[PDB]
């Protein structure tokens, strides 16, 4: 009738068991694909709240007492919120608006790990960098990232080839637009014949109005050309239209001759 009673030893929780998913928004967000993130014990009444907060993650029940974890399954970062920046790798969306810091009731959406190295941003930024939505910093850095795109997957190099062709066509139409001036600047920075010749081609396919306003060093007047012969030095070291012309619209010939001065 007398039972040998003996209560268990006092329990000591571990780091896993003291976790709170309501505090790990800076730990779950930087998780990579198929990486388990233990969030500690989680009550059922708070299941959906987590699932609605992290839709890119699957909620798995690892242990007893509600011990759960989040396993990344997606990168739902939209192209406009991920491609037009170079350091915002994730964001939160509440109602309809997007913030970069966490807010109550917001939903996490993460950008692709290396999204400026895959070509996923070429289509969005090709249209975004045209017109009033052009950015002097983001678009220039995107054209620069195109020249250093460390993507050797057939899809990535094919996408950047298509982007190169679209850029050649668009800048052959009108090179005065800002995105094409940045493209010519980066081509000049490349400093290879494959880039110098494309610079010269794009500049030579321009209208007379473009040349009479931007390319007055490369295409001198009859009088300036006649008088340049009276001097032994190159005309570029003599013509004020060369000393004042922007470097992005100079032919490789004049760009090189300007280096001969002094």
């Amino acid at each position, epitope marked *: 009738v007398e039972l040998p009673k003996r209560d268990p030893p006092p329990g000591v929780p571990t780091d896993e068991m003291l976790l709170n998913v309501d505090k790990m928004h800076d730990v779950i967000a930087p998780a990579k694909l198929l990486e388990y993130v233990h969030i500690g014990p989680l009550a059922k009444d708070k299941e959906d709240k987590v699932k609605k907060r992290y839709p890119e993650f699957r909620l798995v029940n690892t242990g007893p007492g509600g011990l759960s974890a989040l396993l990344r399954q997606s990168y739902a970062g939209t192209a406009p919120n991920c491609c037009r920046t170079f350091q915002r790798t994730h964001y939160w969306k509440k109602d309809g608006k997007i913030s970069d810091k966490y807010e109550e009731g917001a939903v996490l959406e993460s950008c692709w790990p290396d999204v400026h190295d895959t070509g996923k941003c070429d289509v969005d930024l090709f249209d975004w960098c045209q017109g009033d939505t052009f950015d002097r910093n983001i678009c220039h850095q995107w054209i620069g990232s195109a020249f250093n795109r460390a993507d050797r997957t057939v899809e990535g190099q094919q996408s950047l080839i298509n982007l190169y062709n679209k850029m050649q066509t668009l800048c052959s139409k009108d090179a005065s637009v800002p995105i094409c001036e940045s493209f010519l600047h980066h081509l000049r920075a490349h400093n290879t014949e494959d880039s110098k010749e494309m610079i*010269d081609y794009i500049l*030579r396919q321009q209208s007379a109005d473009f*040349k009479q306003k931007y390319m007055r060093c*490369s*295409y*001198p007047t*009859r009088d300036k*050309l*006649e008088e*340049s*012969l*009276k001097y*032994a*030095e*190159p*005309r*570029e070291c003599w013509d004020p239209e060369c000393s004042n012309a922007n470097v992005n619209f100079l032919l490789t*010939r004049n760009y090189n*001759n300007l280096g*001969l001065c002094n």
Partner: nanobody
Amino acid sequence: EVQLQASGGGLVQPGGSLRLSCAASGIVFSNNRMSWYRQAPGKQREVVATITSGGATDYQDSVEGRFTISRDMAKNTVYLQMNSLKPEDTAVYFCNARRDNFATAIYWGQGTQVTVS
């Protein structure tokens, strides 16, 4: 005696190519500015291409991107490569050498006939 011969012309069609030559005698390309001029029948002569003593080249806005001027001072021969010719380029092409820092020391040479039809 200073002499500038001229040759390389001929008959071609719209879109052809030619190569004019000019040998030098008594003129060093190290202190001379060479120039290829063209003069149309009954028009004012115009300079097509020029090259400095240091190899810096310049072209007229019309012939730019098509004609190319090169030199060889080891052989005292200046050239002109006329690619993608046009019927408006038909003229008498001749070479002119002008001394560096001496505007009064300028010499002209023979001419060559070219045509496009």
